[PDB]
């Protein structure tokens, strides 16, 4: 993207204020900076010597270029085998963001099929004609018979009372059936518009209507690479490895995607931001996100005690 543009700008938000509270707790200094790439970090094979190495945040932390990764660290078994961790500050799971938000005429006449309108019009014309014919053969007269046929239909004859009563009962039972089935259609208008978690055989072998992607070099990709029934889905995900989650939001907003695997509360906050986003209901992999830590260090005890002090009081509710 950029050839070389690394500028000092302003950074703030949730974990920044968390770091402000941590600097309020213990007496230390720091230097806020960003990771060079836009990737989490995977232990991918480097091109020489046939060795699986790290990159990104772990690539800068293990090289000594970073001191403490302040990030929602996806705590897993592999990264704990190399470094030490801290208390998981965030308790957050996984979910699927989809697009079920299509705006609505409610099928009145222009989306609705034209049987009843033309049928009732021609039928009440036939009714008016035969009422005027019975008015001729009595056992503004034409306008009177036509307006009688309208006023029976309007819903607000010695030998013609039977015809009028059958037409009136017919008109009311038809408009009652139309009211009933329009109401019953717009109440029960909730079709299958979701994935129902990882338990979806259609995502095991997707199609052109099922376009799902993930973040390039993510820990969720490693968690899927552990399980044997996910690499086939990686055959759909290796062609759509997206750099940032904002690119995934832009792709799924322009209907270039159909499903995205992401943490729950972030997507709930974005659904509060953008009203055209509704996630699925099944919550899975209720995980804990902590702070990236180095090895055995004297800044592991009091830091974790400060995390616990933040957990025990209402400061977590303040961060909420």
């Amino acid at each position: 993207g950029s050839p070389r543009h690394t500028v000092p700008q302003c950074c703030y938000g949730f974990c920044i204020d968390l770091l402000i509270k941590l600097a309020r707790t213990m007496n230390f200094t720091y230097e806020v900076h960003l990771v060079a790439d836009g990737k989490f970090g995977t232990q991918e094979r480097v091109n020489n010597s046939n060795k699986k190495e790290w990159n990104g945040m772990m690539g800068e932390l293990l090289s000594g270029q970073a001191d403490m990764i302040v990030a929602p660290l996806t705590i897993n078994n592999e990264r704990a085998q190399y470094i030490e961790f801290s208390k998981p500050f965030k308790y957050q799971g996984l979910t699927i963001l989809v697009k079920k938000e299509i705006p609505r005429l409610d099928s009145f006449m222009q989306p609705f099929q034209s049987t009843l309108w033309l049928l009732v019009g021609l039928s009440v014309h036939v009714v008016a004609v035969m009422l005027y014919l019975l008015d001729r053969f009595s056992p503004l007269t034409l306008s009177s018979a036509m307006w009688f046929s309208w006023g029976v239909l309007l819903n607000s004859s010695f030998s013609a009372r039977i015809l009028g009563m059958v037409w009136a009962g017919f008109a009311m039972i038809i408009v009652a059936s139309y009211t009933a089935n329009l109401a019953a259609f717009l109440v029960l208008d909730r079709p299958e518009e979701r994935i129902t978690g990882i338990n979806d055989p259609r995502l095991r072998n997707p199609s052109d209507k099922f376009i799902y992607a993930t973040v390039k070099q993510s820990s969720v990709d490693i968690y899927f690479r552990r399980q044997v029934e996910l690499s086939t889905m990686y055959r759909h995900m290796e062609k759509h490895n997206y750099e940032s989650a904002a690119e995934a939001i832009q792709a799924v907003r322009d209907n270039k995607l159909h499903a995205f695997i992401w943490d729950s509360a972030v997507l709930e906050f974005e659904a509060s931001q953008k009203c055209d986003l509704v996630t699925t209901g099944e919550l899975f992999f209720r995980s804990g996100f902590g702070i990236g830590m180095r090895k055995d260090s004297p800044w592991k005890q009091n830091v974790s005690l400060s995390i616990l002090k933040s957990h025990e009081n209402g400061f977590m509710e303040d961060l909420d």
Binding site: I75, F85, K87, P88, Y91, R286, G288, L305, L308, K309, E312
Partner: protein, 49 residues
């Protein structure tokens, strides 16, 4: 007393059973990584409406 009286006084080894985590319990021993998200809540009668 209880499991804290058994583990901190070294009559026990560790508490495999469930235990709430707070400040002084984390002072006396070393808790493991968390494995279950168990907060608090309030149960009421909550009759029909």
């Amino acid at each position: 007393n209880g499991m804290i009286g058994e583990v901190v006084y070294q009559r026990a080894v560790m508490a495999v059973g469930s235990l709430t985590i707070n400040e002084e319990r984390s002072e006396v021993v070393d808790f493991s990584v968390p494995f279950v998200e168990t907060g608090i809540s309030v149960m009421v009668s909550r009759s029909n409406g």
